[PDB]
Amino acid sequence: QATVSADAVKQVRAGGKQVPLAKLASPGVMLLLGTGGILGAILVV
Amino acid sequence: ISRGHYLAIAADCAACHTNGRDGQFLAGGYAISSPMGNIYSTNITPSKTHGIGNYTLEQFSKALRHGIRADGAQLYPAMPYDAYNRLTDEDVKSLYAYIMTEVKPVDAPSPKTQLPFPFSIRASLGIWKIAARIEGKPYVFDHTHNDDWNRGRYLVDELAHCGECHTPRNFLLAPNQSAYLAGADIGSWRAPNITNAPQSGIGSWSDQDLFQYLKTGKTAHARAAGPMAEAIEHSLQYLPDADISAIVTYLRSVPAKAESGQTVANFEHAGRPSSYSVTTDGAALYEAVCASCHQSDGKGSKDGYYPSLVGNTTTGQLNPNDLIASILYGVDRTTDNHEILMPAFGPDSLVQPLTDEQIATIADYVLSHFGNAQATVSADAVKQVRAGGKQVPLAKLASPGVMLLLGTGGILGAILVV
Amino acid sequence: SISDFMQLSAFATGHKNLDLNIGSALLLAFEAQKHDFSTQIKALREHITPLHPTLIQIIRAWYSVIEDETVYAFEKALMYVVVIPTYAHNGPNYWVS
Amino acid sequence: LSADVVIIGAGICGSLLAHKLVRNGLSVLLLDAGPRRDRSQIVENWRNMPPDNKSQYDYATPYPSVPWAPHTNYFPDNNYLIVKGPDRTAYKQGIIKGVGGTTWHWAASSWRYLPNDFKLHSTYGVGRDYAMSYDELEPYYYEAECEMGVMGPNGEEITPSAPRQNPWPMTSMPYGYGDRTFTEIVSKLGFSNTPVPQARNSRPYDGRPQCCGNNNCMPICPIGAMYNGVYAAIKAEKLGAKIIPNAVVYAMETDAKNRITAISFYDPDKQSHRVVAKTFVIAANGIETPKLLLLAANDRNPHGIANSSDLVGRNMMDHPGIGMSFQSAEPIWAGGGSVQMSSITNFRDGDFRSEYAATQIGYNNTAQNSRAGMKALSMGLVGKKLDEEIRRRTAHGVDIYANHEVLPDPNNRLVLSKDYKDALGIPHPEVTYDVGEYVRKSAAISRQRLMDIAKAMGGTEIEMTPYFTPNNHITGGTIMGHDPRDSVVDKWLRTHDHSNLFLATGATMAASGTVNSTLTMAALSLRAADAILNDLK
Ligand SMILES: Cc1cc2nc3c(=O)[nH]c(=O)nc-3n(C[C@H](O)[C@H](O)[C@H](O)COP(=O)(O)OP(=O)(O)OC[C@H]3O[C@@H](n4cnc5c(N)ncnc54)[C@H](O)[C@@H]3O)c2cc1C
Ligand code: HEC
């Protein structure tokens, strides 16, 4: 039943699949969320 | 011809409303590339069912000038209605007579525009133009300048909408009044600076050359390519000589906007002679493709059919976007029903396909020996041109991942207040 | 050892302009062809101021690549490039240049 | 490898058929022995090709010869093609192998055959007439002409020729000085000069530049103004077809029902691979398709695939040409325009065709600069005198050909001889080509006419070849016919014995005709496209 894809090995080399939490550990993502918090402050005003 | 027919020809109205030459003119269904995606032009023939046959003078002007449709939806900014804002109402009503009387209506639909969120909701564009401050009082004939400059300003800014293709944009994709007619990327191609700047614009062009270029698109120092080929073969070539002369006079009064470190005019930059040792060679690979139509020294044809790559505005720009787009797509102009064509050299080329690395190799060579030596082309620079230029900062939000990330941020604020 | 081959024959019996460095390519190819190629060419200058009333083999550097005293005799009437309306009533007839 | 319709040979016929089929939707795989070849590389090779091979026309040196499946070259040959017989030199024709096929190089001359030629057997009782008539192929002629973008003299009545239901997509580009001088002198002599319909863009067409007179139609054009099979190959590949280079098809596994099931092809390193598709199509060459059929003999068919009548390899035709070379008294200035613009088509039809072949006079417009230059160099002149000598020889240099109509003779054959091999062990094709007294009398008449032309033009240093020259288009080898017991393929581009095999190539051609005519191969290939459709609809 088990079957191995070409990119399945590539994931193991990099350290397995990226956990959903780790995507937030990139400078791009926090900047996107930083603006969202700014939106709320102006929204209340 | 009809008075409205002249403006319709002048205003490039038939260019975007026919799918190439095959489709019926003014019938819509023509795809135009935008960073947000593809916006399809809707039919304009006065069809009572599937066209705009129910349009009236009050609402036809509103759709043309202020860009709101009959239903109440906001027309996409792809229309030059921001350019058409200054269009005088006495001239707009002339278009309505032309649309209803001249063009034969067709009961044929056109595909609808589909864009990802948040561009899916049409009414969101109402806020967009408010930040862009389109209005925009109707044009009134200027008095401090002669009658010729008055008509020249009429054709360029609002009639032929030359600005919307030349002047740059901002993060919100709106016209930039500070850098007026400065030149910015348009999808794959790039309109150059056309201000009165002597060394960085088109000021160094002779006035006779400028009039000839806008009339046909063919001059010894520059040839119209890409969108200008569509611009010339559709609208400008039919204009009267006085109006084209009026355009030249106006273009001489636009204030100069210099670029980032330009020393000599693009067409005034000469080239150094070179040859090749009789793959992956700038001199050799350029000779295997270009040496026939042009020459080995880049001087082109003797009489002027093939362009001289030395002192050429397409090669004299610091940004090689025009030169890379010239290789990737080729030029195809049509003056007075006399077509001149250059075969495409992209991955989907029919004559001989060049990969992105290959195109950079010739682009490096031609710029080094015939174009501006300062200019340099990278391997991925060609790849950006194939995809439609660099992604605009606003377009990154047009992905389902980004909106989900921002969606949680709004949720955070609601709980934060509690 | 290059300018001597460049001016080997004459200005009139050859090119008034330069060879555009094809002579350097030609000379470097002749090195494998003839070891004594570099020795005979220098002596030829003094003889004109024996070699070619009887000895013709010295013309291999003159025949050769066509280079038939080349960019051609008539490049203004025949192709190898030119404008599409190439027909202009044969241009000239026998005006060499 | 699995497909729906497999087409072998990505030339004019294979690529046009694949383009039409993928337009119709059903998937098509193109397998070709040659590699993926680019036009720019061939232009570079021709420019760097030794110029001595330009003086005498060479159309294979720029094109690389792959070791596993070499294409024949006629400057000293690699012995890929062996010719036997009294006029073995008549079949000294060359081909180029690779994606785009031999259509990578060709004079762009696309022609429509006379209506009489389709009923040649029923008209003059010689050879085998075509299965279909002119009216049964004219729409496909127009379709192929539109696809390839042919030129044509629309606004002039010329001579008894092929009637047209719709004028040519383009208009004949104006003559140079050489063509005008030749036309006026032959009109004074008594011969009518007619423009040749060429697959050249007189105006921009199908995203390709206008013909700029590079005068290098053969063997490679730097800009692509003329038409090549690579265009249709690329169009088909983009539309959805899958094309594989270096696919040397050698054997086909057939059954007792004569419907083929599998095809095996060698790579350069002998690795065989099997491909299965509903319908199998072979479009190689008039010289390669019969060879492949003979090579693929299996248990069911001992003497060859689809050979219940044993006519493969037989009835080979190729137009015999009589060359000419001399210097005119007055400056012809030949070289302007394309390599082949005008021709004498007055003798293409008549009542005399029942006794001798219809002569097709017409000269070559290739530039004389290289040949004249090396002729003057061989005179030993040096300097200014050499300059006037090269001037005279390139302003008076003239070359004329004179084609003929060679009839199908079953004595001719395509025995794939075992004496000479190749890298993969595939036998080198060998052709025994016979001419017959028909073309002998026709060639005598052509020689008389060529002497007349030379005397009218004041020719000097006249050297006509003493042997019949080739014309590089292979006609016949797999002859059509309504009767399966005297012909091998039917009226619908189908092998009689193998119902599941559709053959569309110059081998299928039935009569040699008068003119340089790969267009009919294009028309028949497009004709076979409907056969693909109804077979899978
Ligand atoms: C000099 C010249 C003049 C011409 N003049 C004219 C003219 O006047 N008028 C005109 O209409 N046309 C003219 N033509 C065009 C010519 O008629 C066509 O281009 C030709 O018939 C098409 O062949 P092709 O290129 O499609 O064959 P290709 O596509 O090259 O054939 C490839 C096939 O060969 C097979 N093959 C190759 N090697 C092997 C092997 N070892 N074992 C097994 N299979 C093998 C492959 O598997 C494949 O099936 C001219 C061409 C030339 C070169
Ligand atoms: C290409 C840049 C265009 C030119 C030039 C003109 N129009 Fe246009 N128009 C264009 C698009 C892409 C759209 C629809 C996008 C949107 O935001 O919905 C439109 C819309 C109209 C309409 C609205 C009704 C309709 O059925 O689309 C009208 C009445 C209209 N355009 C008229 C019009 C006229 C009169 C033009 C000549 C000055 C003209 N358009 C130019 C694209 C383009």
Ligand code: HEC
């Ligand atoms: C003949 C078939 C051509 C070949 C091969 C190449 N080019 Fe070309 N190019 C050609 C024409 C006829 C034109 C202009 C249209 C006219 O009416 O003048 C061009 C244009 C360009 C340009 C821009 C010139 C201008 O628009 O002002 C560039 C930079 C250019 N061509 C470059 C170029 C390169 C790099 C080529 C090798 C890949 C090449 N061209 C091939 C004709 C032909």
Ligand code: HEC
């Ligand atoms: C968008 C469709 C355009 C409109 C409307 C106008 N122009 Fe344009 N122009 C455009 C492009 C994409 C290009 C560059 C083509 C290339 O070779 O890269 C140009 C070019 C010019 C030039 C040449 C300047 C130079 O190359 O340095 C001039 C003088 C010019 N355009 C003027 C001009 C005028 C006066 C217009 C109003 C009628 C106009 N353009 C409209 C794109 C578009």
Ligand code: F3S
């Ligand atoms: S290859 Fe092309 S442009 Fe003219 S002469 Fe030969 S056609």
